Design an enzyme around this catalytic site. Structure first.
Site, mmCIF file in Angstrom:
data_model
loop_
_atom_site.group_PDB
_atom_site.id
_atom_site.type_symbol
_atom_site.label_atom_id
_atom_site.label_comp_id
_atom_site.label_asym_id
_atom_site.label_seq_id
_atom_site.Cartn_x
_atom_site.Cartn_y
_atom_site.Cartn_z
ATOM 1 N N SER A 162 0.936 -1.166 0.082
ATOM 2 C CA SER A 162 0.044 0.031 -0.056
ATOM 3 C C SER A 162 0.778 1.185 -0.012
ATOM 4 C CB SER A 162 -0.685 0.121 1.169
ATOM 5 O OG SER A 162 -1.315 1.294 1.561
ATOM 6 N N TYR A 184 -1.572 0.151 10.350
ATOM 7 C CA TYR A 184 -1.607 -0.181 9.027
ATOM 8 C C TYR A 184 -0.344 0.138 8.300
ATOM 9 C CZ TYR A 184 -3.439 -0.931 4.297
ATOM 10 O OH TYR A 184 -4.201 -1.172 3.041
HETATM 11 N N1 LIG Z 1 -9.136 -0.266 -0.970
HETATM 12 C C1 LIG Z 1 -7.691 0.607 -0.852
HETATM 13 O O1 LIG Z 1 -7.682 1.659 -1.173
HETATM 14 C C2 LIG Z 1 -6.482 -0.124 -0.443
HETATM 15 C C3 LIG Z 1 -5.301 0.655 -0.880
HETATM 16 C C4 LIG Z 1 -4.049 0.186 -0.266
HETATM 17 C C5 LIG Z 1 -4.028 -1.348 0.156
HETATM 18 N N2 LIG Z 1 -4.976 -1.935 0.121
HETATM 19 C C6 LIG Z 1 -5.136 -3.452 0.576
HETATM 20 O O2 LIG Z 1 -5.742 -4.418 -0.424
HETATM 21 C C7 LIG Z 1 -6.130 -5.520 0.020
HETATM 22 C C8 LIG Z 1 -7.530 -5.934 -0.420
HETATM 23 O O3 LIG Z 1 -8.442 -4.893 0.207
HETATM 24 P P1 LIG Z 1 -9.821 -4.059 -0.148
HETATM 25 O O4 LIG Z 1 -9.673 -3.000 -0.773
HETATM 26 O O5 LIG Z 1 -9.893 -5.316 -1.273
HETATM 27 O O6 LIG Z 1 -10.798 -4.353 1.099
HETATM 28 P P2 LIG Z 1 -11.796 -5.613 1.597
HETATM 29 O O7 LIG Z 1 -12.073 -5.344 2.735
HETATM 30 O O8 LIG Z 1 -12.904 -5.685 0.789
HETATM 31 O O9 LIG Z 1 -11.141 -6.975 1.162
HETATM 32 C C9 LIG Z 1 -9.956 -7.591 2.218
HETATM 33 C C10 LIG Z 1 -10.447 -8.864 2.300
HETATM 34 O O10 LIG Z 1 -9.658 -9.582 3.030
HETATM 35 C C11 LIG Z 1 -10.385 -10.653 3.939
HETATM 36 N N3 LIG Z 1 -9.606 -10.922 5.398
HETATM 37 C C12 LIG Z 1 -9.440 -10.040 6.527
HETATM 38 N N4 LIG Z 1 -8.718 -10.646 7.249
HETATM 39 C C13 LIG Z 1 -8.618 -12.061 6.884
HETATM 40 C C14 LIG Z 1 -8.012 -13.020 7.593
HETATM 41 N N5 LIG Z 1 -7.598 -13.239 8.919
HETATM 42 N N6 LIG Z 1 -8.354 -14.269 7.012
HETATM 43 C C15 LIG Z 1 -8.712 -14.409 5.514
HETATM 44 N N7 LIG Z 1 -9.185 -13.335 4.979
HETATM 45 C C16 LIG Z 1 -9.270 -11.916 5.522
HETATM 46 C C17 LIG Z 1 -11.863 -9.846 4.450
HETATM 47 O O11 LIG Z 1 -12.708 -10.765 4.665
HETATM 48 C C18 LIG Z 1 -11.938 -9.373 2.816
HETATM 49 O O12 LIG Z 1 -12.902 -9.932 2.017
HETATM 50 C C19 LIG Z 1 -5.825 -5.428 1.640
HETATM 51 O O13 LIG Z 1 -4.300 -5.781 1.840
HETATM 52 C C20 LIG Z 1 -5.874 -4.037 1.818
HETATM 53 O O14 LIG Z 1 -4.970 -3.690 3.060
HETATM 54 C C21 LIG Z 1 -6.475 -1.461 -0.314
#
Ligand SMILES: NC(=O)c1ccc[n+]([C@@H]2O[C@H](COP(=O)([O-])OP(=O)(O)OC[C@H]3O[C@@H](n4cnc5c(N)ncnc54)[C@H](O)[C@@H]3O)[C@@H](O)[C@H]2O)c1
Ligand SMILES: NC(=O)c1ccc[n+]([C@@H]2O[C@H](COP(=O)([O-])OP(=O)(O)OC[C@H]3O[C@@H](n4cnc5c(N)ncnc54)[C@H](O)[C@@H]3O)[C@@H](O)[C@H]2O)c1
Ligand SMILES: NC(=O)c1ccc[n+]([C@@H]2O[C@H](COP(=O)([O-])OP(=O)(O)OC[C@H]3O[C@@H](n4cnc5c(N)ncnc54)[C@H](O)[C@@H]3O)[C@@H](O)[C@H]2O)c1
Ligand SMILES: NC(=O)c1ccc[n+]([C@@H]2O[C@H](COP(=O)([O-])OP(=O)(O)OC[C@H]3O[C@@H](n4cnc5c(N)ncnc54)[C@H](O)[C@@H]3O)[C@@H](O)[C@H]2O)c1
Ligand SMILES: [Mg+2]
Ligand SMILES: [Mg+2]
Ligand SMILES: [Mg+2]
Lengths: 260, 260, 260, 260
Positions: A142, A155
């Protein structure tokens, strides 16, 4: 249509970026093993991937439990025969508070899911790739890991840890024809989780953002040179590039997907 | 003598870099609160510090216990009246193994002591520094967090986390006249921490180092442009610089102490 | 009070950061060789330095002329005997315009003075230091080199080149007991430079700043975590640190002096 | 086949990377405008491109001459009608010598070709791209710009300049739907440009490499985690990724293509 006959384990597959990436890899002919701790979201995602006409199965698994990860990866190897690609993407955003008031139990939780859990998955999958003497891995870091943001102590630290893990993993696995890289998305929207970050930074009241959520959304977007947050759909193509042959001499790298 | 009147809390104070830094800051006039989980080491270190002519006290504390950290910090404040400087330095080197075979329990242990413990101390101490509208903090990161090394999955990720945390803390605390920086030592020697690394890297049998320890120390020193490891005593001055007024407009930065 | 017996050649000495730094080094007992193309600025600077009580001489010299630089360094060596320190600081701010309309002649001029000119000085001086098997060098880069700013194409490229040249020189000169580092100041004010930056950025009318200079100053200050521009008097101590023994195991590094 | 109907201007099109990249882009359906100072290499290069069955034309032009650059760009827009893509790649490797002995005339020549000339091209072409409110640009940096290498003072500096210039241009041009990114190849072989690097480093006799060219080659490959130099054909796909829609939210980034 590349990736035919390839198999990818996507963690956090029930979430925004995970589902969007699975579909893209599928549209490319990739077989998908969906792993998420959220059953409802998981099955909803499995359905959308199945339509793409590729083989796909789901596994409810909490990545912080290494025993559950190992059993799940073994079931994956058994069900698909091999794991070519890994999108090590499950993650938790964490609370938003300045460091002096940052909830301590939440801090350890963020590290445990985002770092230790990502590591449980990378370790188990990497052993399999070693037996295949082939594998490509993308870890979701990220922009918060590239530069620690205000009020995101946990984070940010988790994602900075992921960037170093990616470099160490790239070195350790290089001898077995495995490459390991990372993506670092910036402001992605909309939908939700963009709204979470907007509402929760607003609630803090630090000098970095207004306490008015509409105003905060403008400050965030206003900080991006392209002057828009990114669409979730602008990430799967970067993942595919890092898994495919055009990045054949790239490993240990971190790609900002942040608008500048 | 600058620092006359100042008080610095040093964690990992019974260890190598912690003691060296405590001595240097004492020579400059600062009263020292030593914190370490090792009582035998602390006591020998406290006596050396007092030899320098300043007030010095010892606190046996495991930074992984927030209750112990908060208790200790409160005692430090009761005894010294304030805490001007913090050298957040306690750390654990971790095992040495390629990622596919990295001991999972050790991985969580490295993160808990190096990141969560470091965070417990930073939080408790910054609360006091906010009360004072004054504070200067230096977190011990490592060249391992600047670029992940081979066979050091957990350690490199823990220091990559410290680098981002340092950035977030700098942002969070700037409004209260607090600065937060990090140092990132490269190869430092002699002693068994230097020896443990040569020895344990040699033991892995990876492509990055010889299996012969004499050759590994050569390979390591041979990767340094200055062609020598650094002395532990070449670190205190850097810490002092980041705590004093010559760095008044610097916060959020990380200083490599690595020979090139 | 160290630096007694030391000799420092400062380029751009008639300028603000240059004069500030020469005074601080003189306060530590170091004799100063002042180099600048601006005679009026130089003589006033020299008067200020002598006031400190150390030996000092001024040399009118345009660093873009290698022959002028060579002859000047020879003269400094005859006059002082050796050159222990070098603060390679002379520079020019350049025009402010978006890249598509950046004045081409100015672009070349920025590179010649800020890079080629700094290289002439660095080369001539390193020859003397190798002869002495001793030398510490600090090159003045800029946060514009760390991250390219809007409307400053030439200046950012010139300082990014200085950051790379600093790393190569550190490698090249390491075997002779010479260390080479850089500093990267961020926003500094008040004064001519600050006024110019603000005014000319406002005039561009780009999306990065207001079109009203009053607001542009507030936006620049507002981007700093410490929420103030730095005082050039917060730079000499950093240069002094990089020159003295507390940075003995540090070479090839770039220190941001930017407020966060 | 994406890129059907696209026009890309490639500078240094007669060289290894430029030819290899134009062929790949031609296979994707891109019309190539080949630019180089060497007519004979252009002739062969255009012959190879034509064979991919796309419209292609050559232009003899010395990027250090701004008048020639503007005239050539105007011709390209006349002949193809638009310039959607730019691979700003012409460059000169420079002499190989420790900084204290670096030939000063060559130092300036390196900057002028690798920075000023790339800038001449970038400016003229961005003006066209602004007219279309569409453009993707890729500048060729190098790992030498990421970290200054031994004995390559001028080249590392010129490539560090390209990385900063890339960031500034990304900021400046983002409002017109243009993206600007860079690639930073590491050790790419075999061939005579790789042999030149190996031979000339060996010739310097610095502590960084063996004096025996054959051993130098092995030391260079041995410093790569993937333990092999990269093939020139492992660069085209990266440039294409950076020009295509999969990198739609990426601008201002530099991608190492270095093997780890
Ligand atoms: N959305 C953004 O702007 C953004 C920016 C930078 C990084 N990210 C990263 O991208 C990745 C995906 O994020 P998102 O945007 O898709 O959010 P999101 O919440 O929709 O998806 C994250 C998913 O991981 C699962 N998860 C959480 N804890 C878990 C565990 N212990 N075991 C198994 N699964 C687990 C959740 O249930 C969820 O479905 C993450 O690593 C997040 O930190 C997102
Ligand atoms: N020695 C090197 O080359 C090197 C290089 C880079 C970074 N570092 C880092 O510098 C710091 C100091 O390291 P060292 O070289 O001084 O080693 P060290 O072992 O001598 O000192 C570390 C000290 O921290 C203490 N400690 C460990 N866990 C603790 C806990 N839970 N609670 C309280 N104290 C605890 C130990 O008892 C020990 O005294 C560490 O953070 C280390 O990782 C060292
Ligand atoms: N002031 C800032 O905000 C700031 C920010 C970042 C970097 N810097 C850098 O710091 C350095 C000094 O900055 P300043 O604030 O002191 O500026 P300044 O204008 O006060 O002084 C620069 C000095 O260098 C001299 N100089 C310029 N070209 C020369 C040449 N060809 N030969 C000899 N002398 C020459 C000038 O005559 C002048 O005395 C420069 O390299 C500058 O780019 C300054
Ligand atoms: N080969 C590598 O390992 C490597 C590694 C990192 C970066 N690079 C960079 O990649 C780019 C491609 O280089 P190469 O590997 O293709 O070498 P190359 O020599 O085969 O090609 C460079 C091309 O640019 C042309 N050129 C040089 N000066 C010019 C001028 N003034 N005007 C117009 N054209 C000019 C040359 O005539 C030649 O055709 C260069 O910028 C190079 O520095 C190469
Ligand atoms: Mg990091
Ligand atoms: Mg003045
Ligand atoms: Mg740079």
């Amino acid at each position: 249509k590349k990736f035919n006959g390839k198999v990818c384990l996507v963690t956090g597959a029930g979430g925004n970026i995970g589902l969007a990436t699975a579909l893209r890899l599928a549209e490319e002919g990739t077989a998908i093993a969906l792993l998420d701790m959220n059953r409802e979201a998981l099955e909803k995602a499995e359905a959308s991937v199945r339509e793409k006409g590729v083989e796909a199965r789901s596994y409810v698994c909490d990545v912080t439990s290494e025993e559950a990860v190992i059993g799940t990866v073994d079931s994956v190897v058994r069900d698909f025969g091999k794991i070519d690609f890994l999108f090590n993407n499950a993650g938790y955003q964490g609370a938003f508070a300045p460091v002096q008031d940052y909830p301590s139990d939440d801090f350890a939780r963020v590290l445990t899911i985002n770092v230790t859990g990502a590591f449980h998955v990378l370790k188990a999958v990497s052993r399999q790739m070693i037996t295949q003497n082939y594998g490509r891995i993308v870890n979701t870091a990220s922009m918060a890991g590239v530069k620690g943001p205000p009020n995101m102590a946990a984070y940010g630290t988790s994602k900075g840890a992921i960037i170093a893990l990616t470099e160490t993993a790239a070195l350790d696995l290089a001898p077995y024809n495995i490459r390991v890289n990372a993506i670092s998305p910036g402001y992605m929207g909309p939908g939700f989780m963009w709204e979470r970050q907007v509402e929760l930074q607003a609630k803090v009241g630090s000098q970095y953002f207004s306490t008015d959520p509409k105003v905060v959304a403008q400050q965030m977007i206003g900080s991006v040179p392209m002057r828009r947050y990114g669409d979730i759909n602008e990430i799967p193509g970067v993942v595919a590039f890092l898994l495919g042959d055009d990045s054949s001499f790239m490993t240990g790298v971190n790609l900002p997907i942040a608008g500048g």
